[PDB]
Design a protein around this ligand. Structure first.
Ligand SMILES: NC(=O)C1=CN([C@@H]2O[C@H](COP(=O)(O)OP(=O)(O)OC[C@H]3O[C@@H](n4cnc5c(N)ncnc54)[C@H](OP(=O)(O)O)[C@@H]3O)[C@@H](O)[C@H]2O)C=CC1
Ligand SMILES: CCc1nc(N)nc(N)c1-c1ccc(Cl)cc1
Length: 202
């Protein structure tokens, strides 16, 4: 873990639902902007990585791919740890891409890496949130404020142990992501949402 490793996720409260019928139930435009900005913000000439499971890669519309200005890592158990002509890292485990990045001195095409973001897959989230190299969680806490009868029926969840983590102050979130970040509850449609940061509670 030379660069710091964040698990970045938007989770419905209180049970941390992250998906429904194979996709994301809410469209929150500013949450999107936050995701883009945080995962993209690096020192001049540096870059961040975004690590995702194959199904999340397939959910991303093709006009976004690879996610611009970031090192794309796709995890598939059939991958052969190859980098393609677009620069995308097709690796078979998080452990194997961490070893490869390390022997590269945590550089991508001569660009130092600043942060490594785990952006996706329930499967990937729930494996890696148990990897001790994960240094923090960037959790957008999403709240449904519409009518009970129209609440999303979440079917996939972040199985995270609250007790193993400690929420940090908003100032610490902003210091880490390198950006001013809206504080408190953001509103869009039937949803309220708040940006939060958590570190290990050892
Ligand atoms: N709310 C949020 O912030 C986010 C929500 N989501 C939601 O998550 C859901 C999709 O997540 P999920 O369906 O779990 O798909 P994932 O994106 O986690 O990718 C799953 C794939 O990852 C690969 N994989 C699984 N375990 C391993 C392993 N141990 N080593 C290497 N590769 C592995 C497999 O590909 P193979 O079979 O080829 O090995 C598997 O099919 C959707 O509902 C989406 O909306 C997604 C991202 C963020
Ligand atoms: C912008 C939504 C979003 N917000 C946050 N805070 N984290 C994420 N990991 C994502 C995300 C969701 C679905 C996909 Cl397919 C990719 C990324």
């Amino acid at each position: 873990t030379r660069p710091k490793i964040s698990l970045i996720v938007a989770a419905l409260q209180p049970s941390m639902g992250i998906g429904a019928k194979g996709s994301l139930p809410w469209r929150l435009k500013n949450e999107m902007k936050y995701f883009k900005d945080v995962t993209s913000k690096a020192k001049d000439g540096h870059i961040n990585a975004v690590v995702m499971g194959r199904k999340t890669w397939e959910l991303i519309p093709e006009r976004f791919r690879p996610l611009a200005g970031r090192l794309n890592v796709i995890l598939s158990r059939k991958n052969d740890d190859l980098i393609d002509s677009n620069g995308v890292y097709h690796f078979s485990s998080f452990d194997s891409v961490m070893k490869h990045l390390e022997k590269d001195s945590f550089r991508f095409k001569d660009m130092p890496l600043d942060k490594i973001f785990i952006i996706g897959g329930s499967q990937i989230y729930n494996l890696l949130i148990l990897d001790s190299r994960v240094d923090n969680l960037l959790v957008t806490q999403v709240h449904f404020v519409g009518e009970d009868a129209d609440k999303p029926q979440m079917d996939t969840f972040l199985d995270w142990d609250l007790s193993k983590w400690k929420r940090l102050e908003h100032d610490k979130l902003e210091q880490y992501v390198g950006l001013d970040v809206p504080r408190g509850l953001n509103e869009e449609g039937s949803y309220n949402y708040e940006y939060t940061m958590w570190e290990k509670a050892q």
